[PDB]
């Protein structure tokens, strides 16, 4: 595997510096790229680097070291919008096959949950027939894993209230369905 | 679109000694554009199997080439270079002087 | 000390006689070492110095690909410049590219350069800082803007400052015997009577490398106001160079005149006199 | 080696 | 600048398929990459200029052609499940400079079109507990039993699309993790003040766009035809 990145995911606190590394095997590489990919979207170029050294643009810095065959990206003041997959790409002049990509590194920018208040609720179908919701836990709680469907966690932002909650859902078609202790 | 007319020099690789194998050179330089016809002549007759350098150019963009062949100079045989180019109304003929 | 790796690229449109002719030659200092010319079936990059004759197919496969890419883009730029200047398809045009990197005596990057020319004139020049371009006219200004938008200067600087320098090192090693072990001029004066009362003295420098040389005639170890014919330095064909410098002098007064030769290949400048 | 980078005029 | 079509596509094993890609930048170089989940882009094929093509790392199963500068279609010969993937077209100025990618084509290859179902969509109403305990009301949307995994879930609040307060699962859940042909579930949350919840003149709708068969596909089942379509669900706001 010619271009190496850790898959991660990596976690960074909102506001903190994120750092991402990429190595490549061929000293014939002459061009280097960092692409960002949002879930279900196409790669968008963040930065390009060709000369050995540091290169700066806004919150982003890149470093290229051709002697040690690595490239890196640094994101200052990580924001929720920096949560993405970061793709490393090199142009290998010895092989010429356009850009060769690493496997990508996913970055999760975690916000500080102001007032952690872990509460399991339950919610009835709006057309007779009810799901479970784990909400208001802190950004360090990790949600766990038949007929037991537990989604992964995600964070919402009530902009006008300035308020961010985590939240993870679960459901079942069984009548024997706890809810109150669904997330164990 | 610049046009520049070739400069020409005709000369041996080594100082000439009658009877002794050598190389005859014609060096055309300072011309534009690149298309050029050069022949090496023994007593007016075009020599076959003449070779030349790869086309290159100078700081001013003008081109140069070396046309050359193996030859064996004698007291009596005359040798020359003949050049045609778009800047030339007729082929220019420059005679090999072995002291130049 | 000062060494350089330079390429000279020539593309010439041939209206309805095929695609443009494209030739690329590579020099280290004053020594040609490679060439590509798209007049063959497989045009391939090929060695043109003996010290490259032992490079493997990784070098030639890459440099072939790279040269073909170069030709293709030159066909594109020839079309483009034809449009800018509103020229017909009937006429033949020339696009030329020269670039190089130089080393200092420390073995490090000292400077780089890159110029384009259309029909034998400056068109677009990379400035000394390798960060920006100079356009000669309205058409080149469009080319400047396109290069700005594309960060071409950044890309070229990366070649000139890193890649160019790395390979120039490799070449100076592989070609040390030619490139670092210089050839001093073999030097001599010939005598050619002009009239009954004057002769040409001609100071020859032969077999030298590299090309740079100085030939000077002195009368009584001092300058003169005499007829001083100097010929352009010229290739011998064998990798070396020739030059001469002639003065016409009163017959009988030849011993007053001395030829001074400076060349990097000599331990010390040499002086020279006609020997009857 | 040749430049891997080709300006488009 | 790079127009790739189509955005979604389902295919039966053995079917053939041409993805289109056009560019307006008049650049020489064009490429096709694919990307399987959790992995990077791998080059399928590329084109140095009009008239020329070249293989990439993973050419097998695929053809390309390049008549014009502008266009560079990719052609699946004989669709196979392994070719389920996201395909990205790109244009480049130089062989080794910036790739500009298209919007991508999400393609799933299924052994039988019998396996394609649209989503069933339900909106779930806020726990009263949550409303006491927080003064904040989480609506949940759940979309069930869809295949292939080609869905876009939105929230519409009084018939206008909203973003604030929303959080959708990044990937969906396999209802049966065993079966290679498993149908999928996706959850999403909208959370708003208990106040905006308990105004009865307030309409919350969970929209789920699904991509399935075309009109020109042939359907031979008592089920209704899994065409492209939106499936919605709603609640109204409640005094209590």
Residue numbers in the entry:
A (entry chain D): 2 to 130, 133 to 148, 152 to 190
B (entry chain B): 0 to 99
C (entry chain A): 1 to 276
D (entry chain C): 1 to 9
E (entry chain E): 3 to 242
Give excerpts from the publication.
HLA-E typically binds nonameric peptides derived from HLA class Ia signal sequences (known as VL9), leading to its stabilization on the cell surface for innate recognition by NK cells. Here we report the characterization of three genotypic variants of an HLA-E-binding HBsAg peptide, Env371-379, identified through bioinformatic predictions and verified by biochemical and cellular assays. The crystal structures of the a09b08 TCR in complex with all three HBV pHLA-E*01:03 complexes were solved at 2.25, 2.35, and 2.61 Å resolution for the Env371-379, Env371-379 (S3N) and Env371-379 (L6I) peptides, respectively. In all three structures, the a09b08 TCR engages with pHLA complexes in the same way, and in a canonical fashion, with the TCR alpha chain positioned over HLA helix 2 and the TCR beta chain positioned over HLA helix 1, allowing both CDR3s to sit centrally above the HLA peptide-binding groove and interact with the peptide.
Only 6 of 70 peptides tested showed a measurable Tm value, with the peptide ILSPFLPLL (Env371-379) demonstrating the highest thermal stability (Tm value of 47.1 °C). This peptide is present in all forms of the HBV Env proteins (large, middle, and small). The three HBV peptide variants adopt a highly similar conformation, and the positions of residues in the HLA-E binding groove were also largely unchanged. The peptide contacts are predominantly through hydrophobic interactions, including the TCR alpha chain H94 stacking with I1 and P4, multiple TCR residues stacking with the side chain of F5 which protrudes from the binding groove, and the TCR beta chain R95 with L8. Additionally, the side chain of the TCR beta chain N96 (one of the residues introduced during affinity maturation) forms hydrogen bonds with the peptide backbone at position 6. We observed that the Env371-379 peptide sequence forms pHLA-E complexes with limited stability (t1/2 of 6.7 min), while two peptide variants, Env371-379 (S3N) and Env371-379 (L6I), bind HLA-E with greater stability, reaching t1/2 of 39.5 min and 2 h, respectively. In agreement with the t1/2 of the complexes, we observed lower ImmTAV EC50 values against THP-1-E*01:03 cells pulsed with Env371-379 (L6I) peptide (3.97 pM), followed by Env371-379 (S3N) peptide (5.34 pM) and Env371-379 peptide (60.9 pM). Furthermore, recognition of the non-mutated Env371-379 peptide was completely lost when endogenously expressed from a minigene in HepG2 cells. This loss of recognition could be attributed to the low affinity of the Env371-379 peptide for HLA-E, thereby hindering its presentation on HLA-E at the cell surface, and/or the potential sequestration of the Env371-379 peptide by HLA-A2 molecules in the context of assays with HepG2 cells as targets.
